[PDB]
Amino acid sequence: ADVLTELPGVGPSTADKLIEGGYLDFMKIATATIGELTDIEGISEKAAAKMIMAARDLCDLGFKSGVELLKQRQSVWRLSTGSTELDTVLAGGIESQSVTEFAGMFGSGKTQIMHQTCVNLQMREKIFADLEGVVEEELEAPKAVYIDTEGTFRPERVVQMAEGAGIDGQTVLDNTFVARAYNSDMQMLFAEKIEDLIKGGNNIKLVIIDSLTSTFRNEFTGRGKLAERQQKLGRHMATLNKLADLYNCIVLVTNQVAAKAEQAIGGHVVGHAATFRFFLRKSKGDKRVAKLYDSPHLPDSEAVFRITEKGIQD
Numbered sequence: 001a002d003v004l005t006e007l008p009g010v011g012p013s014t015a016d017k018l019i020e021g022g023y024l025d026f027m028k029i030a031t032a033t034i035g036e037l038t039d040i041e042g043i044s045e046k047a048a049a050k051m052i053m054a055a056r057d058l059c060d061l062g063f064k065s066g067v068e069l070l071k072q073r074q075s076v077w078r079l080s081t082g083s084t085e086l087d088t089v090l091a092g093g094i095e096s097q098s099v100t101e102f103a104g105m106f107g108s109g110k111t112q113i114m115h116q117t118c119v120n121l122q123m124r125e126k127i128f129a130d131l132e133g134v135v136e137e138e139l140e141a142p143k144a145v146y147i148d149t150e151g152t153f154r155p156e157r158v159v160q161m162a163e164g165a166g167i168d169g170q171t172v173l174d175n176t177f178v179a180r181a182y183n184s185d186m187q188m189l190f191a192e193k194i195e196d197l198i199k200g201g202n203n204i205k206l207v208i209i210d211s212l213t214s215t216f217r218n219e220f221t222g223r224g225k226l227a228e229r230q231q232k233l234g235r236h237m238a239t240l241n242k243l244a245d246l247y248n249c250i251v252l253v254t255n256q257v258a259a260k261a262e263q264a265i266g267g268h269v270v271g272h273a274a275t276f277r278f279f280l281r282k283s284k285g286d287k288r289v290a291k292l293y294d295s296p297h298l299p300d301s302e303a304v305f306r307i308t309e310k311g312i313q314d
């Protein structure tokens with residue numbers, strides 16, 4: 001919480017050395033390691049160790065029980081997908097503090113959903129938050145980050161969906177950051193640089209990686225390169241899960257499929273890292289089916305939706 005000097009043992013000099021290293025929030029320090037803190041100019045091990053324990057304490061990161069357990073869950077806000085049936089399967093909508101994955105064959109609607117969420121983020125009526133755990137100013141001027149790894153981001157579609165929702169398309173564009181990544185290195189670096197946007201005053205509440213695996217699959221083709229691929233993708237996923245928890249934001253990813261009748265690629269690393277996993281498939285015409293096949297507390301379920309000129313509906 002911005003004022004690091006409120007941390008016991010931390011004076012103005014230290015606070016400066018810290019912000020430089022990219023530490024501007026209590027939680028970031030509380031979850032750091034003595035190593036990464038000592039990597040900063042004149043921050044000793046004793047100090048590093050001390051502020052870490054102080055930050056944890058300040059954020060009250062201890063044992064919780066009873067009602068406190070429900071309170072923690074109230075800090076999770078949800079975003080509407082534009083589909084009633086889909087939102088119901090999600091038990092409200094897409095959850096912040098988690099990674100939700102949409103995998104499916106070509107044209108199943110993975111990118112459409114990504115675009116719709118950018119629009120919905122700009123409509124508070126589309127955001128469902130418990131006032132008892134999410135302060136309204138935490139939702140003010142929400143911004144989205146779209147890491148486009150295939151080059152399929154379409155400003156036109158965002159504007160069109162915005163119109164379809166009854167709001168200004170230019171407003172959505174002004175509040176949506178897009179980063180075109182040509183390989184996994186850029187993809188991962190962009191994800192890591194999202195912190196700079198937040199530090200810059202942007203309230204990043206939606207992070208989209210479309211596609212999550214296309215780059216990796218094309219860069220590590222040999223089966224004798226499976227381990228290589230998994231390790232890098234694993235670090236990427238960890239970065240994603242941490243920013244989702246740390247900044248109470250939604251992380252949305254898309255995934256392609258492969259035969260054996262099909263399954264999402266990315267291996268176990270993506271399998272374990274994603275909290276919610278969906279399989280998108282096409283039906284008659286503009287109809288689509290979204291099958292939730294993995295989550296920590298929701299049963300497997302299907303939702304029928306459509307992709308139209310307005311965007312996602314039903």
Ligand SMILES: Nc1ncnc2c1ncn2[C@@H]1O[C@H](COP(=O)(O)OP(=O)(O)NP(=O)(O)O)[C@@H](O)[C@H]1O
Pocket residue numbers: 104105106107108109110111112113152157160256307308309310
């Ligand atoms: N403006 C529009 N109006 C109505 N339908 C549209 C419009 N734009 C796209 N679609 C539909 O969206 C489908 C493609 O959605 P898309 O989100 O790109 O699929 P995808 O799963 O991400 N495929 P891919 O990127 O290859 O993996 C089309 O084939 C169109 O039927």
Ligand SMILES: [Mg+2]
Pocket residue numbers: 097098099241244245
């Ligand atoms: Mg999480």
Ligand SMILES: [Mg+2]
Pocket residue numbers: 110111112152
């Ligand atoms: Mg796509």
